[PDB]
Amino acid sequence: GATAVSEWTEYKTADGKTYYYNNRTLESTWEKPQELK
């Protein structure tokens, strides 16, 4: 089966980090999601 590409937003934090925030299930991803292609 294929692995989908969900809602992967990039947010620039005051910590100076690029986090990802799964707008999928309203999940977060600090580093690159598994579904991140």
């Binding site: 947010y11 934090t13 910590d15 980090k17 986090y19 925030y21 977060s28 600090w30």
Partner: peptide, 8 residues
């Protein structure tokens, strides 16, 4: 569009 707060 407002940002979500970051997780710890």
């Amino acid at each position: 569009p407002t940002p979500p707060p970051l997780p710890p």
